[PDB]
Amino acid sequence: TKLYNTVDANNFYAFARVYSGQVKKGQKVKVLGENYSLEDEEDMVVAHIA
Amino acid sequence: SYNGIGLPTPRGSGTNGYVMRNLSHVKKVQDPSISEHECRRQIESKLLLYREQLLEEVSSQHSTDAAASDSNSKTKSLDEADVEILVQKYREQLLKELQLQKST
Amino acid sequence: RPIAHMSESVFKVAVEPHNPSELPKLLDGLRKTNKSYPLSITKVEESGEHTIFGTGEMYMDCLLYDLRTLYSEIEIRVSDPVARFCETAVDTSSIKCF
Amino acid sequence: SFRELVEEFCAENSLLFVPLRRSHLSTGSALFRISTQASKARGITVYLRNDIIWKKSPGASEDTPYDPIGFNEILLMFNNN
Amino acid sequence: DLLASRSIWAFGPDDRGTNILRDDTLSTDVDKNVLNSVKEYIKQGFQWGTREGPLCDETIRNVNFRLMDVVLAPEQIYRGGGQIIPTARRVCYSSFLTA
Known part of the structure; x- marks a missing residue:
């Protein structure tokens, strides 16, 4: 729900609440946008977790 | 230097700045009645659905009466005779609209 | 579900770079700003100028401070603030429209 | 304008012009989705810039980056499936 | 009233919007399947029209677009959603301006 500035304004930290499962660094996750649905599947973006 | 009035610095001019206020500034129906007719026919349709609800209530009363007779499910009172009395009400409202047009 | 905020933006300010040679950094700056402020609504008009929507004047002040200093260290020309309008109808349609 | 041009072109070819309520992150332009029919697995995502x-x-x-597409390319890719 | 209360199609623009898409097609319409076919993409046209106002490029508030009459004779082949959305947007604009 939030993005936070690093000490230098270069990258953002995503503030997330893990509702289920487990997460490890380097994991492959799929990011869903605000209007991702069965109609709009193009809001998906594959990303790693640094 | 204040509200767009004044010079940036008094140095360089023969003055001291000191801007003053001017002290003399002058501060000074609907044409296509077809819409109403369509609304009238639509409220007639709302009354039609209301009487269909009343007919459904009468059908429930008939089902209860038939169940009581059996003692001595859900059924329908009138499948199609309601359409004839509906056409009668259509004639009635057409007479109403004719009378209203004559009155105007 | 997307967040249901407690207020709308209804406070518009138009910005542009001081010199158009540094237009791309402002665009990246606006992107970063849009990331960091949830009710900020960065929009681009037909004229090419960029508008920003914020909750109030303090909101826009902090937003423009971050835009100038934090994200895109350039200098920008900020227009006077203006409200966000809406249109409505007060009387029934005069004629049928097809 | 060109927007009405593409609108009536999609109208002629019996396609569906759906506005995706999104804006491009880099250019800020609105994103649109054109679907051939109720089959939604095939759908083209397109934005409009400088005609x-x-x-x-x-x-x-x-x-x-975004690669260009033409009317004839759209029809060729939508008529073969 | 009853039929008007049952005829609420959608809110525009999007949910939580302050516009109501209503339809009063006089009933007596055999083409109910055709009407329900064209409704699913007249909804999108109504949302598009009420999101981007004709008076200025802005949202519309506190207005119901009660549909009056729709006429379309041929079969479903000629009913293209993209062919009819601009018509819905334009008629919404024109009705709003006349109001």
């Missing part, structure tokens, strides 16, 4: 329709390869990241 040329811009397309993205399926499965590509956002930072990847």
